[PDB]
Amino acid sequence: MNIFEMLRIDEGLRLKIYKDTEGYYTIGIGHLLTKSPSLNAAKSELDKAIGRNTNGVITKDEAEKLFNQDVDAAVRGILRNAKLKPVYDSLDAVRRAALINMVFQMGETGVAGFTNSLRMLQQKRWDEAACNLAKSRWYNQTPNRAKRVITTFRTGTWDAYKNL
Ligand SMILES: *SC1=NC(C)(C)N(O)C1(C)C
Ligand SMILES: [Cl-]
Ligand SMILES: [Cl-]
Ligand SMILES: [Cl-]
Ligand SMILES: [K+]
């Protein structure tokens, strides 16, 4: 297991434009295209992201290319954020992946707002951090995925992704 395999499990792989769990146009391995309700706007974003006229369909290689860019972008967002970088730096590699996963799903600013959870993670109070992370819109709207990410923070193991 690693961050790529982890997010591939959590996000799936679809080669045609679909709506994510928030209703937003998405493609590939959880590549968010736009929050606009306009499918034409989403298709325009897709063509710009891939560099050709796709008509809303891409290949597996193209999906994996966007995915690698998106994982890279999540890590860069952590490293440039004054609240996320100290927590990231304090974590082992397994828990770092859990933080990258959250930033991939909700964005840098969204995760940086989890001030009390971040403090508990910085303090390595793992059970308390896990409890606090579940008091969230995130957990209520995507509980099975949040439970996997939270278990990864609680234990520092890949047990929540093992048989998947
Ligand atoms: S939430 C929560 N915090 C403690 C560690 C006290 N718990 O046992 C729960 C209920 C999981
Ligand atoms: Cl330490
Ligand atoms: Cl709490
Ligand atoms: Cl709550
Ligand atoms: K998805």
Curated annotation (Swiss-Prot):
Cellular-component GO terms for this entry: host cell cytoplasm
Catalytic residues in the record: E11 (proton donor/acceptor), D20 (proton donor/acceptor)
Domain of life, source organism: Viruses
Effect noted on mutating E11N: Loss of 84% of enzymatic activity
Keywords: Antimicrobial, Bacteriolytic enzyme, Cytolysis, Glycosidase, Host cell lysis by virus, Host cytoplasm, Hydrolase, Viral release from host cell
Effect of E11Q: Complete loss of activity
Name of a matching Pfam family: Phage_lysozyme
GO biological process, one term: peptidoglycan catabolic process
Catalysed reaction, written as an equation: Hydrolysis of (1->4)-beta-linkages between N-acetylmuramic acid and N-acetyl-D-glucosamine residues in a peptidoglycan and between N-acetyl-D-glucosamine residues in chitodextrins
Tagged with keyword Hydrolase: yes
Enzyme Commission identifier(s): 3.2.1.17
pH dependence: Optimum pH is 7.3.
Gene3D superfamilies xrefs: 1.10.530.40
GO molecular function, one term: lysozyme activity
Induction behaviour: Expressed late in the viral replication.
Residues the entry annotates as binding substrate: L32, F104, S117, N132
Effect of N132 to M/F: 2-fold decrease in enzymatic activity
Record localization: Host cytoplasm
Similarity annotation: Belongs to the glycosyl hydrolase 24 family.
Function as written in the Swiss-Prot or TrEMBL entry: Endolysin with lysozyme activity that degrades host peptidoglycans and participates with the holin and spanin proteins in the sequential events which lead to the programmed host cell lysis releasing the mature viral particles. Once the holin has permeabilized the host cell membrane, the endolysin can reach the periplasm and break down the peptidoglycan layer.
PANTHER family membership: T4-TYPE LYSOZYME 1-RELATED
Protein name: Endolysin
Lineage summary: Viruses, Duplodnaviria, Heunggongvirae, Uroviricota, Caudoviricetes
Gene: E
